[PDB]
Amino acid sequence: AIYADNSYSIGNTPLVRLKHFGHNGNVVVKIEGRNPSYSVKCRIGANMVWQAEKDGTLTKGKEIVDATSGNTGIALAYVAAARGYKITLTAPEMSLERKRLLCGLGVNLVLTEGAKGMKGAIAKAEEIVASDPSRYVMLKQFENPANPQIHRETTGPEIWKDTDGKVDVVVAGVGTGGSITGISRAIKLDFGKQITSVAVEPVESPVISQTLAGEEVKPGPHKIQGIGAGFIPKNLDLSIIDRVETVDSDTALATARRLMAEEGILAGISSGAAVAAADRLAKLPEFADKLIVVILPSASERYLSTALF
Amino acid sequence: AIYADNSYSIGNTPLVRLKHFGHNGNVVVKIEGRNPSYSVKCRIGANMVWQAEKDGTLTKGKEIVDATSGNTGIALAYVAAARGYKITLTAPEMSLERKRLLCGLGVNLVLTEGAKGMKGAIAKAEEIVASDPSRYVMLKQFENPANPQIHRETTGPEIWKDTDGKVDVVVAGVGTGGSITGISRAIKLDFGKQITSVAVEPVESPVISQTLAGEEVKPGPHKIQGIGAGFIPKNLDLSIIDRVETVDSDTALATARRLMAEEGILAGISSGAAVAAADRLAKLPEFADKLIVVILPSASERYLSTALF
Ligand code: NA
Ligand code: NA
Ligand code: NA
Ligand code: NA
Ligand code: NA
Ligand code: NA
Ligand code: NA
Ligand code: NA
Ligand code: NA
Ligand code: NA
């Protein structure tokens, strides 16, 4: 049928079997690049706005304020326009692409200082909302339960259905933790199957690995955009994570290049990280006959001025 | 279920109702940006390769050769990689984006001369195939019947199904003519409904309008990428075209900007042309109670270095 606005069209993304990764086709990928704003975030942009409306936090008149490095800003920005909200986004004043894309979607952009970076813009966002709390709503991707909820309701059931319940393993890079949390809850709790949930983080910032091992948390710089926030976010449910896999920046990129040239899949850099990690678990006899489903958060063109090209 | 390669995942694209165009929601758009390679072309890349295989023109060993300004090169290029063909693409040596994207997908790129432009590269493609006819296959988007056939089989039936047969008008910019031809054949001949088929061309190169009016064909330069090839291609079936609408380059762009900021739809420049044209037919009493479905060939990020931003 016909979606009332772009927000209602989120998801129903396809499963594609890999040919040059895994073992006799045991690695299938979910292309989240096929969304209204072309990322997994389209799901949480739609559901964080919907839920804020259902509980009167977001009202006709009120104005979205938020800080974004990328995908969620673009997602929350297509939703704002579709549903008729003014939005203000703050960002480490960067990617000229993402700046031009955001102004294109009718976002009132506020640039912070580089040296301060991501936490620079968060502060600035908060100030704008403390200037007039009654007119501003910060949705807060890293802790908003509406983030994991849409993945329990949509991304997870789609995996169940499309695999006919044969899914044995889910692999998901962790940014907010929303996807692995929501997906894992759907299959383990709603559908009653005891899959292996695998979180993927950069080896350069292995904070989930470090936490779970009782070792000093040392975050670090990497090139895998969308994962490796350098802290454990509230929307990563550790309790549902059966395994953590680390990937280096170089491998992730090469794997993203391999996905394009060898499989004809236009995947983002974080997509190369999940697939590198899935490929390793797939070439262990213990996962040989298991069906491994991998989340490919974004598409290639979002990355044209990055190390991916 | 699970697609054997990226080629099998083409289409099943969503219908989104517009809010700031048409009259009481009579204009709904089909987002073809949601495809393996993020355009309508993904459909013809898949089906031109499939059909060449089904009739032994394309064989394991053989090598795709073709000339492309954009979308079909990227489409045929993701298919080549997914199905395991080497491909050579020639192009007016341009858009650095599209160059980097194509090399990214494992395409052996051949650049021609600018001044000669699009017909420059066609010639060069032909030479490469005359150098060794037995190892090269040119698929020829502008006349290959497999182009309109996939739209009769997929894009058209999806419109029928999603609208429940209530579709009254289809609006489609014409590049190859494949989409309007295939879609129109599905609904008029396969489903038996006498819709208005509307072809959209730039007012700067109104060659379809000029032809049908028995007036001298004067092609001209414009900024609407993907339509207005400046000749009538063999895959445009004039016989199924009930009406032709012309749009200027400036309007098309503003409409593409309106689609982003007002509707939260990331559409390409040609998407602004179809919607401008649909909006005019929608605000005539004669189309007031009619359901108008519009083809939005591509997505915004394909256009970041263009006049759209
Ligand atoms: Na596999
Ligand atoms: Na990832
Ligand atoms: Na996750
Ligand atoms: Na990605
Ligand atoms: Na990424
Ligand atoms: Na409308
Ligand atoms: Na068009
Ligand atoms: Na067409
Ligand atoms: Na377009
Ligand atoms: Na276009």
Residue numbers in the entry:
A (entry chain A), B (entry chain A): 2 to 94, 96 to 311
Sentences from the paper on this structure:
O-acetyl serine sulfhydrylase (OASS), referred to as cysteine synthase (CS), synthesizes cysteine from O-acetyl serine (OAS) and sulfur in bacteria and plants. The inherent challenge for CS is to overcome 4 to 6 log-folds stronger affinity for its natural inhibitor, serine acetyltransferase (SAT), as compared with its affinity for substrate, OAS. Our recent study showed that CS employs a novel competitive-allosteric mechanism to selectively recruit its substrate in the presence of natural inhibitor. Results show that CS uses a noncatalytic residue, M120, located 20 Å away from the reaction center, to discriminate in favor of substrate.
Similarly, M92 interacts with main-chain carboxylic group of T69 with the distance of 3.5 Å and M96 interacts with main-chain carboxylic group of S70 at a distance of 3.7 Å. In the case of HiCS, mutation of either M92 or M120 completely abrogates the formation of reaction intermediate (as both 330 nm and 470 nm peaks are not observed), but mutation of M96 has subdued effect. On-rate binding constants of mutants of HiM120A, HiM92A, and HiM120 AM92A are ∼286-fold, 80-fold, and 200-fold lower than that of HiCS wild-type. HiM92A exhibits approximately fivefold increase but in the M120A background, M92A mutation fails to reverse the effect of M120A. However, OAS binding-induced fluorescence quenching of M92A mutants shows species dependency with StM92A showing 62% quenching as compared with 1 to 5% quenching of HiM92A and MtM92A mutants. Mutation of M92 also affected the substrate recruitment although to a lower extent.
